[PDB]
Ligand binder design. Sequence first.
Ligand code: MET
Ligand SMILES: [Cl-]
Length: 237
Amino acid sequence: RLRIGVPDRASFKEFVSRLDGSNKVQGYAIDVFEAAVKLISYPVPHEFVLFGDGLKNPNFNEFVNNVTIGVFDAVVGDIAIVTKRTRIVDFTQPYIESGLVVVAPVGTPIRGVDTLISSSGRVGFQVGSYAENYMIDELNIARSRLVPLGSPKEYAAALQNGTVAAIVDERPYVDLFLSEFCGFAIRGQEFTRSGWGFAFPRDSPLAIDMSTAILGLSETGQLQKIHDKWLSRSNCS
Ligand code: MET
Ligand SMILES: [Cl-]
């Protein structure tokens, strides 16, 4: 029986979240995982364990580290495949493209990651995201400029009342945000490229077998249909 960690997301619950009146889980990443398990040649008995304080998204670096220390046999969620995590776990091949973008109010001076860096303005990020350490370590954005944000309603409010000048987050969250809230746009293109995967212990054969199962979902069209089930774009209006 695999003890599978699942993030107890406080927002963008479409990706993965607690089933409201229980300890059960649901979402895009859960449906991908359960669909993929059906295509594995051998049994993968499992149970899901929620991770997080229940008030804000968990820290995904700490979440993934729970596989390294044996608390979880695997983690399933909207987990970016970023270099420092691949040191301590084996990921599947990605099941969705993702990377960091800048989002700002339509008509902003900010044109992309370069004008964000040279700006004085505060920058929002999603609490628990690898974006926080990427901005501090790789882009050398002052920690004093970063504001944690919890939800798309908070993104819209922080951009509109000038708590932040811009938000850096991964494309899939930004796509849901822009489907709900008017007046904002992606500035520039992705400046990272790391999809989402599931994570297993170093040298786990399941990381490879689950890659083949994810590919099988892609080739049958199930993977696109699971995205359409949870993440269908719409008019902010
Ligand atoms: C807070 S968003 C979920 C975490 C983000 N996708 C990451 O892998 O860091
Ligand atoms: Cl990276």
